[PDB]
Amino acid sequence: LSQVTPKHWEEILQQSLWERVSTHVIENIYLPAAQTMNSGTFNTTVDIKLKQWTDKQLPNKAVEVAWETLQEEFSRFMTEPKGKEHDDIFDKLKEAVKEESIKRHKWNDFAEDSLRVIQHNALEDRSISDKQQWDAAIYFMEEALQARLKDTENAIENMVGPDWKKRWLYWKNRTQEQCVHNETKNELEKMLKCNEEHPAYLASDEITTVRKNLESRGVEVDPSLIKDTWHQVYRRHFLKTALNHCNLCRRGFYYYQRHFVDSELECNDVVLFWRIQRMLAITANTLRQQLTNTEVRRLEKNV
Amino acid sequence: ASDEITTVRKNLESRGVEVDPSLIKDTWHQVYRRHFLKTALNHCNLCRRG
Amino acid sequence: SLIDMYSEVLDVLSDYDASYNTQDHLPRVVVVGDQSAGKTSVLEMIAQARIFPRGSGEMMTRSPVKVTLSEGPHHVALFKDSSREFDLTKEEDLAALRHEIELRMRKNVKEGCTVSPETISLNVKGPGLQRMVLVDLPGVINTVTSGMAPDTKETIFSISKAYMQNPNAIILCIQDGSVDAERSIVTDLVSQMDPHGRRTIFVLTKVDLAEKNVASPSRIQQIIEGKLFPMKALGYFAVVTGKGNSSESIEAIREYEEEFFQNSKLLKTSMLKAHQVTTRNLSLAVSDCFWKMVRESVEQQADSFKATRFNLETEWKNNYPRLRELDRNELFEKAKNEILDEVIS
Amino acid sequence: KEVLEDFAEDGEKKIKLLTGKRVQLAEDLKKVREIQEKLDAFIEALHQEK
């Protein structure tokens, strides 16, 4: 098990850890901070949220992710079928020892405290000296944004359905509720188009206006449904806006190189994602070294 | 109603026009009077053979 | 010593935070008493000096006083706003201090009222004094005095409730031993506001007078052992405030109280525990419990303050990385220099 | 010079004139740091007694 290339361990650890915490990071930190248009307030909120989460929750998640990855490789190797030559009498003993060993497993307690400082200093940097690192952060942001966008599209498609061109090709007819949601979508489209910087939250008088236009179409919709549709529409619109920001920030490295703070192309999100990506690389390497050295002796002792 | 004024004002802002509620009320009064008179004229045509 | 810094921290916290958002995170000592219930005598006994004004049945305490007991080379009292030291070892200075405190009480009174809600922080130093912070409050009057404002009773109740709002505040109820618990509203309020009793402490005054009144031993034992009172507190203590005279010396009262309890038949009969009497035992227990709670609370506050300051510094860097923070005075100096430069230009 | 001296002696006018994010941040940071310094001295002195 220790005769595996370190690259394979790092790739698995990085992907597992990133997917484990991507939902929490984006939803609970990025989204609340992105609402404000003030870059200084946005950055301050991100830093406060990062410190609160990292000091208490980050080491626990990293330990669980690293232990789970070790469990996957170890348990699989215990039960890898070596073709027709695989023996079956030893499998029962292997499984019994595996379960007992897992129960007796105990990760180092001092690793959590040490790693807390390690990633704290790693994330404290705010300078990207490499052009390729900036490009890598853009690509990493695009992949993460596309995954979230696809989930948002799936929810929107479920509530509405396929396009009239597409539904004609597939011979599918929208339900009465689906058509109601489609009409609400058009109303929200016009509202967002007129006010390109509308706040995320809603107001009662806005619901009244929307409801009246629906009654003009002979459609009655409860305020709760309008709020739910608005939330999904705003999320989709914000993700598309971020994608446009990524395209503008693609050639913004040269501007950032001269510290063009006065320039409106303040790619704060790209810098923040680059810090996360750099932190993940350090964390993956550190966990790989700890797995290869620290916990091997404990595994042997328990066996 | 006040919420009706809000709706109308928002659509005006979508056109980049700011209008006070008082002006909207005055215009609505004249428009309603003209609409009601036209409605009565249509009623007269229907009531011609009534 | 240590309590001097703790008292200073509380004062600055009150000035910085007008609301009790942060002030309700540190332990405090709250004292509530009735009229002629010996509340002043008990506070004077703990301070080992009669510094509050005395009156023939009149509520001289017209304004709350934050009396702080600390460690000092001599037993002296110092005002927070005034540097004029008063030596409590001399009776002449004690009388002058009482007049000064009464004058401060009248000065702080606003228009249309008789008792002001403002609290005056007083630092009473002395060698061997217990390191704790006490709060003096006007006595609760069953009947509103004609010479006082109609809202004086409401103001006293509001001040007591505001002080008791701190979940870590220690309640110190003071009443009279010659009056039954059903005839006083303060004891009912204390029990209602502390259903758990994790911090309630009850102090009974005029125990010698109650004993001379042939009080029933069952009622006294139930009060001390917490049987008659539905609330279950940490403990109960009884102290003697003398014969009730407003001119008796503290030393004579303390010596008489010790002799009275030593020769008391109730203690020698083991009806009441020997460690549940005298002011020394009560002061030591309160000081140790209060200090331990302070130690835990101050550690949490220090970490929170450091984190809060870090957030403010981070915001400053994000918004103004190339600027320097200056106070109101320094900004005025910088502004005038720029004006002079523009004059020359 | 005369105007500045009169303004300097009246802090209330300064408070009314000095209203801004930078001013409030500096004042709050000074107060918080002052409280924190007192807390550190209190904690260290308390723990050094034993």
Strands C76-79 and C120-124: antiparallel
Tokens matching residue D39: 């807390």
Strand order in the sheet with C235-238: C28-33, C169-176, C200-205, C235-238
When computed from its CA atoms, the radius of gyration of chain A, rounded to whole angstroms, is 25
> Judged by CB atoms within 8 Å, which residues 191-210 of A form the interface with B?
194-195, 205, 208-209
Is C82 labelled as part of a ligand binding site? Answer: no
Tokens matching residue C279: 């002011």
Q: How far is A212 from chain B (nearest CA, A)?
A: 9
Q: On the CB side of C192, how many CA atoms lie within 13 Å of its CA?
A: 6
3-state secondary structure of B6: helix
Q: Tell me if there are at least 3 CB pairs under 8 Å linking chains C and B.
A: no
Phi-psi group of C324: left, alpha or beta (phi > 0 → left; psi -120 to 50 → alpha; rest → beta): beta
Closest to C44 measured CA to CA, from C159, C119, C148, C122: C122
C-alpha to C-alpha distances, A145 to A34, A46, A211, nearest whole angstrom: 14, 18, 32
Query: Within chain D, how many helices (H) and strands (E) appear?
Result: 3, 0
Residue B3 in contact with partner chain A when CB distance is under 8 A = yes
State the distance between the two ends of chain A, measured CA to CA, in whole angstroms: 14
Q: What's the rounded Cα separation, in Å, for the pair C258 and C208?
A: 11
Tokens matching residue C211: 């004993």
Q: Which residues in chain A have their CB less than 8 angstroms from residue B14's CB?
A: 190, 194-195
Interface test with A, best of C315, C320, C323 (most A CBs within 10 A): C315
C-alpha to C-alpha distances, A67 to A20, A64, C228, nearest whole angstrom: 13, 5, 59
Q: How far is A81 from chain C (nearest CA, A)?
A: 54
- Residue A255 burial (10 A CB sphere; 0-12, 13-18, 19+): middle
Amino acid at A97: V
Q: What's the rounded Cα separation, in Å, for the pair A255 and A284?
A: 31
Is C36 labelled as part of a ligand binding site? Answer: yes
Neighbours of C295 (CB within 10 A): 14
Nearest C-alpha in B relative to A205:
B3
Whether B7 and A194 lie within 8 Å, measured CB to CB: no
Q: What's the rounded Cα separation, in Å, for the pair C278 and A209?
A: 75
> Judged by CB atoms within 8 Å, which residues 211-250 of A form the interface with B?
212-213
- Which H or E element spans position C123? strand C120-124
State the distance between the two ends of chain D, measured CA to CA, in whole angstroms: 56
Whether A208 and B3 lie within 8 Å, measured CB to CB: yes
Amino acid at D34: E
Amino acid at C32: V
Nearest by CB: A40 against C307, C310, C318 = C318
When computed from its CA atoms, the radius of gyration of chain C, rounded to whole angstroms, is 24
Q: What's the rounded Cα separation, in Å, for the pair D40 and A89?
A: 66
Whether C2 and D33 lie within 8 Å, measured CB to CB: no
> A67 near A107, Cβ under 8 Å?
yes
Interface test with B, best of A205, A213, A214 (most B CBs within 10 A): A205
Q: How far is C338 from chain A (nearest CA, A)?
A: 24
Q: What's the rounded Cα separation, in Å, for the pair C234 and C197?
A: 7
> C244 near C234, Cβ under 8 Å?
no
Query: Could you give the angle at the alpha carbon of C106 between the alpha carbons of C105 and C112, nearest 5°?
Result: 120
- Which H or E element spans position B34? helix B21-47
Strand ranges inside C139-266, DSSP E: 169-176, 200-205, 235-238
Instruction: Quickly tell me which residue has 């911090």 as its tokens.
Output: C199
Whether A48 and C319 lie within 8 Å, measured CB to CB: no
Q: What's the rounded Cα separation, in Å, for the pair A116 and C124?
A: 47
Residue C315 in contact with partner chain A when CB distance is under 8 A = yes
Find all residues with CB under 8 Å of A105, minimum gap 6, and list them.
A67, A298, A299, A302
Q: What's the rounded Cα separation, in Å, for the pair C141 and C131?
A: 31
- Residue C181 burial (10 A CB sphere; 0-12, 13-18, 19+): middle
> C105 near C59, Cβ under 8 Å?
no
| Phi, psi (degrees; rounded to nearest 5) at A293 | -115, -55
> C122 near C79, Cβ under 8 Å?
yes
Tokens matching residue C323: 């600027």
Is C80 labelled as part of a ligand binding site? Answer: no
> A69 near A13, Cβ under 8 Å?
yes
Is C57 labelled as part of a ligand binding site? Answer: no
Residue C319 in contact with partner chain A when CB distance is under 8 A = yes
Tokens matching residue A162: 């396929």
Residue D3 in contact with partner chain C when CB distance is under 8 A = no
> C36 near C176, Cβ under 8 Å?
yes
Find all residues with CB under 8 Å of C173, minimum gap 6, and list them.
C32, C33, C186, C187, C190, C200, C201, C202, C203
Residue C213 in contact with partner chain A when CB distance is under 8 A = no
Strand ranges inside chain D, DSSP E: none
> A149 near A236, Cβ under 8 Å?
yes
Tokens matching residue A71: 């469990």
Closest to C310 measured CA to CA, from A30, D26, A48: A48
When computed from its CA atoms, the radius of gyration of chain B, rounded to whole angstroms, is 16
Q: How far is D42 from chain C (nearest CA, A)?
A: 6
Tokens matching residue C14: 């009150």
Q: Which residues in chain A have their CB less than 8 angstroms from residue B4's CB?
A: 212
Interface test with B, best of A190, A193, A194, A214 (most B CBs within 10 A): A194
Q: Which residues in chain A have their CB less than 8 angstroms from residue B7's CB?
A: 208-209, 212-213
Label residues B7-44 b or e (16+ Cβ within 10 Å = b): bbbeeeeeeeeeeeeeeeeeeeeeeeeeeeeeeeeeee
Please give the resolution of this entry in Å, rounded to 1 decimal.
Answer: 6.4
Q: What's the rounded Cα separation, in Å, for the pair A290 and A292?
A: 5
User: What torsion, rounded to 10 degrees, do the Cα atoms C201, C205, C211, C215 define?
Assistant: -60
Q: What's the rounded Cα separation, in Å, for the pair C291 and C284?
A: 11
- Which H or E element spans position C53? none
Query: Could you give the angle at the alpha carbon of C88 between the alpha carbons of C85 and C94, nearest 5°?
Result: 90
DSSP β-bridge partners for residue C86 = C77
Tokens matching residue C251: 């030393």
Neighbours of D31 (CB within 10 A): 15
C-alpha to C-alpha distances, C15 to A147, C9, C11, C21, D11, nearest whole angstrom: 51, 10, 6, 12, 18
Concatenating the DSSP letter of every residue in chain A gives: ---S-HHHHHHHHHHHHHHHHHHHHIIIIIHHHHT-S-HHHHHHHHHHHHHHHHHHTHHHHHHHHHHHHHHHHHHHHHT---GGG--SHHHHHHHHHHHHHHHH----SHHHHHHHHHHHHHHT------HHHHHHHHHHHHHHHHHHHHHHHHHHHHHS-S-HHHHHHHT----HHHHHHHHHHHHHHHHHHH-TT--SS--HHHHHHHHHHHHHTT----HHHHHHHHHHHHHHHHHHHHHHHHHHHTT-HHHHHTT--SSS---HHHHHHHHHHHHHHHHHHHHHHHHHHHHHHHHHHH-
Tokens matching residue A261: 């703070």
Closest to A33 measured CA to CA, from A268, A256, A263: A268
Is C41 labelled as part of a ligand binding site? Answer: yes
3-state secondary structure of C257: helix
The DSSP 8-state label assigned to residue C136 in this structure reads: B
Positive or negative, the Cα torsion across C284, C222, C261, C35? positive
Method used to solve the structure = cryo-EM
CA A218 to chain centre: 41
Concatenating the DSSP letter of every residue in C293-312 gives: HHHHHHHHHHHHHHHHHHHH
Nearest by CB: B14 against A194, A205, A212 = A194
| Phi, psi (degrees; rounded to nearest 5) at C209 | -65, -40
Strand order in the sheet with C65-69: C86-87, C76-79, C120-124, C65-69, C132-133
Nearest by CB: C5 against D15, D36, D42 = D42
Residue C308 in contact with partner chain A when CB distance is under 8 A = no
Q: What's the rounded Cα separation, in Å, for the pair A210 and A89?
A: 70
Residue C314 in contact with partner chain A when CB distance is under 8 A = yes
Within chain B, what is the greatest distance between any pair of CA atoms?
49
Nearest by CB: D46 against C2, C315, C336 = C2
Find all residues with CB under 8 Å of A84, minimum gap 6, and list them.
none
Q: Tell me if there are at least 3 CB pairs under 8 Å linking chains D and C.
A: yes
Q: Which residues in chain A have their CB less than 8 angstroms from residue B6's CB?
A: 205, 208-209
Find all residues with CB under 8 Å of A74, minimum gap 6, and list them.
A1, A98, A299
Q: Which residues in chain A have their CB less than 8 angstroms from residue C307's CB?
A: 51
Closest to A13 measured CA to CA, from A246, A238, A289: A289
C2-16 and D21-49 are packed helices; what angle lies between their axes, rounded to 10 degrees? 160
- Residue C10 burial (10 A CB sphere; 0-12, 13-18, 19+): middle
- Residue C67 burial (10 A CB sphere; 0-12, 13-18, 19+): buried
Is C40 labelled as part of a ligand binding site? Answer: yes
Strands C132-133 and C65-69: antiparallel
